Structures are given as C-alpha cells and as structure tokens.
Ligand binder design. Sequence first.
Ligand SMILES: O=C(O)c1ccccc1/N=N/c1ccc(O)c2ccccc12
Ligand SMILES: O=C(O)c1ccccc1/N=N/c1ccc(O)c2ccccc12
Ligand SMILES: O=C(O)c1ccccc1/N=N/c1ccc(O)c2ccccc12
Ligand SMILES: O=C(O)c1ccccc1/N=N/c1ccc(O)c2ccccc12
Lengths: 118, 116, 116, 118
Amino acid sequence: AEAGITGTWYNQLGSTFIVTAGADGALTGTYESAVGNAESRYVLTGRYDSAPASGTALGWTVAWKNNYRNAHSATTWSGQYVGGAEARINTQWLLTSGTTEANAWKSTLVGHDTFTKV
Amino acid sequence: AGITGTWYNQLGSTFIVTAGADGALTGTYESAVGNAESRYVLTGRYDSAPASGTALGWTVAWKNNYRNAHSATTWSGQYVGGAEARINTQWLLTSGTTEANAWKSTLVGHDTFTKV
Amino acid sequence: AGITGTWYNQLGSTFIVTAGADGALTGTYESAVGNAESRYVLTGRYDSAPASGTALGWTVAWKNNYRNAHSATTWSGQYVGGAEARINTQWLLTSGTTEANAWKSTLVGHDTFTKV
Amino acid sequence: AEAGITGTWYNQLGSTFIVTAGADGALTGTYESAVGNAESRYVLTGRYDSAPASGTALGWTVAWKNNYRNAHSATTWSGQYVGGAEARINTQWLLTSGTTEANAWKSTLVGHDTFTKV
Ligand SMILES: O=C(O)c1ccccc1/N=N/c1ccc(O)c2ccccc12
Ligand SMILES: O=C(O)c1ccccc1/N=N/c1ccc(O)c2ccccc12
Ligand SMILES: O=C(O)c1ccccc1/N=N/c1ccc(O)c2ccccc12
Ligand SMILES: O=C(O)c1ccccc1/N=N/c1ccc(O)c2ccccc12
C-alpha cells in the first residue's frame, strides 16, 4: 500500500528505484540505472491500485533522458507488489528505442526484473 | 504539440494526452473494452529531444470512482508524426493475483493509435 | 488444408507450411529481413481439433548452409480461416549472448500472415 | 551442444522437459506440465543453433493437446542454453489460446521459465 510501496528498491542488475506512492494512485520518483548508455538519475511516473483486494497491480515508465544524456528510448515496467516479510515487486518490461520506419520491426526488447526493498 | 491531442486505438478506446516541454505525459483514457464506459487517469514519459520515431510510454491502473479491476496496463512505443500521424505500441496488462496464479498474470499485445 | 499453403508477413517474408493430421507443422521460411536471401527450416505444433481461432506456433533458428546469425525466433498465435484467411501472431527473437548482455537478448514483436 | 542440450530438465513450476537435439538442428521430445488444464505428456518440436559462437539460441513449441485432453492453446519458448557447471536454459514464453475475433486482443500471456538439467 501507499506505505508498502513507498521507499527504495534495487533490482537484480544493481539499479536503484526510489518511489513515493500517493493516495490518489500516483507513483513518482527517480530511477538510477546500472546498464545501458546511462548516467545519473532519471524521473519516473506511474500508477498503482490504491484499493487492492493478493498482489497490488502497478506500472511505471522511464524515458532515458536527463540533463546529461539522451538514449532516445523508454522502458515501461508492469507487475505487482507483494508485501510481507520479503516484500518484492515482480515485473515484466518493454524497452522501445526511437527508430526509422524500416527498423521499427526490431525496436522493442522484453525482459523481467525483480525488485527487493531496502 | 504533435503528441498532444486525442487518439484512438483499434478497439475504439480514446486516449487524450498532454505532452509537457519537459518530457511528461498526462491525460485520460476511456476504454471501449475489458468492461468500462468510464475514464481513467494516465501518466507517462517521452523523449522531449528526439533524434526517427519519438520513444514514449504510459501506464493506466484500471481503478476509478466506479470500478476496480485490480489491474494495470503499460504501453511502450514510438510516435511517428507527419500527415498521417501514429503511435505504434506494444503493451503489458498485469492483474493482481495470488502467488499460485502469478505465472499467468500478464497478457501481452499491440495497439496502434491514430487521430481518426 | 486451410493452414497448409504459402503465406506472407508484412515484411514480405514467405512462410511455406504443411500441417499434419496429427498436429505437426513443417516447412520453410524465406526472410525478407534482418539480412537474408535464403530459406530456413521451421518446425511447430497446432491444435488439430479446434473448438474459435486455431492455436499454433513454430520456431526458426537463423542458421542455414550459407549463414549463421546465432539466433532463433518463435511465433505464437492463431489461424483464422474464411474468405480472407489470416495467421495473427506475436513473436520472440532471442540471440545467443554473453551473460553480461543477457538482459537485452530478446526482442518482442507481432506479425500478420496472409495468402497475398 | 547436441550432447549439451539432450536430456531431462525441470522448470521452476515442477514441469518436466525431455529433449533430444539432432545434428541437423532439430529438437524433439516431450513435455510434462504441472499447471493449467493439463494431464499426461505432450509432444514438443523446436530448432537450435547447431554451430554456436556464449549462449546457444533455441526455441520450441507445445500445442496443449494429447489423447486425453485439449485446451486449444499453444506455448512457444524462446531463449538460450548456457553450459558449464550449472547448465541452464533461460527462456521467455508466449501462450496463445484459440479465441473468437472479439476476444483476440486478450489471447496471449507472456512469462519466463528457467530450466535446470538433471
Ligand atoms: O537499468 C535497468 O535496471 C533496466 C532494467 C530493465 C530494462 C532496462 C534497464 N536499463 N535500461 C537502460 C539504462 C541506461 C541507459 O543509458 C539505457 C540506454 C538505452 C537503453 C536502455 C538503457
Ligand atoms: O481499453 C483498452 O484500449 C486496452 C488496450 C490495451 C490493453 C488493455 C486495454 N483495456 N483493458 C481493460 C479495460 C477496462 C477494464 O475494466 C479492464 C479490466 C481488467 C483488465 C483490463 C481492462
Ligand atoms: O524475417 C522475418 O519475417 C522475421 C519476422 C519476425 C522476427 C524476425 C524475423 N527475421 N529475423 C531475421 C532474419 C534473417 C536474419 O539473418 C536474422 C539475423 C538476426 C536476427 C534476425 C534475423
Ligand atoms: O506447464 C508449464 O511448465 C508451463 C510453462 C510456461 C507456460 C505455460 C505452461 N503450462 N501451460 C499449460 C499446461 C497444461 C495445461 O492443461 C494448460 C492449459 C491451458 C493453458 C496452459 C496450460
């Protein structure tokens, strides 16, 4: 929940996700990545189910552009928050890169990330 | 400017968005499926300084004042401007589930948005 | 019968398949992309006793007598027969990579096959 | 390789994959599933890179129909074989169910399976 989700998380790559869950279902924070043509932090925005039933559905987006670099790509993570002892966020993600129309067919990667809460 | 406006997917859903100078996407989404009749809030990000399509994404949690589906969809794609502007995406829809049903909680698909 | 035949995707690739009574799919795929000019073997499965589309899938490893891309694509979808028959799919393309590049080894997409 | 891939594997759900890798790049075997509207074994067919460079690219399909049941669906696994001490097959999969044209938009699931060799 609000409290549940809010905090600092890390994924299997060593990436850092700092998030605040608002009462209106908003997610806002920053993402600090370990891989790609990256550097420094990036702004994230998302939504979550503020009135869950076991898991809490959520998703967020990161556009890989900050004041220092631009990779012309964006990633969206879709998954669920599972509270308890070992609170975790289990996700599947899609990374799309800006391409020409000829290359569009191979513009999207798919993967999975597991986040653990500090 | 180009992204800002009203769009529609193949299902007939309506995506009304405002693109900020800074890279933010804000707006509302009115579904023609799953089961709705109502609008939902959406939030996202986009490359505000593109190179040729413009990368973007947004999320919608399927909960409003009237109903709660306990699910969320994320769209990831690119905006291709011109005379016949389009937003080409691939999406992931995840439902809240018990751990036993977790293996099959996510659906994958593709949507094409146009201004008509 | 219906599935057996010659099909084409949006890229112009050619899919020649034979559907067995038993559920097997066998054939050849000639790519119009990535970078080819040549054919590759394909193998798959299909529901040989459908209920309304017919579920199927097949894999192509991108290695023939001439080249080796060290990759493979799997297509998963459904055949929808009628006057204007189609095969609607979603695909995964995985390249062999070092463990360090493993996170980004798979591309996702969608293809539509028709008889024209 | 042929020898590398050939054998018995299990995934995180307790499913069993028995496979034989042919010299011509063919994969043939049987799959025995722990989840779904399933029972008994099902035939699998696939292809793999018979002349790899680190990982070996491969993929296979299962149509969920045997002499005992039919769920009118098929799954395709795409991934790589990584040899060594802890030989594993890392995959991403797509499961499509036969549906009417109205429901086609929500006909496909996406997930990930990790196979360990006995
Ligand atoms: O970092 C993660 O945890 C991460 C997790 C899941 C998917 C992608 C990720 N990272 N993606 C990038 C990070 C930094 C960059 O400069 C990039 C440049 C181009 C494309 C992707 C990236
Ligand atoms: O609407 C689209 O254009 C749409 C486009 C892509 C993916 C999903 C979509 N819609 N999904 C739902 C809409 C309304 C609901 O109440 C739901 C309840 C449970 C799961 C999904 C939905
Ligand atoms: O051809 C299609 O219709 C096609 C359709 C969907 C997905 C992939 C495809 N083709 N992919 C390749 C074709 C030829 C190659 O040498 C490759 C080398 C590396 C990676 C992919 C390919
Ligand atoms: O079993 C795995 O390891 C498995 C792993 C990945 C994806 C799917 C799986 N299993 N899928 C089914 C198994 C048995 C069934 O009767 C089904 C009926 C309908 C849809 C899926 C299945």
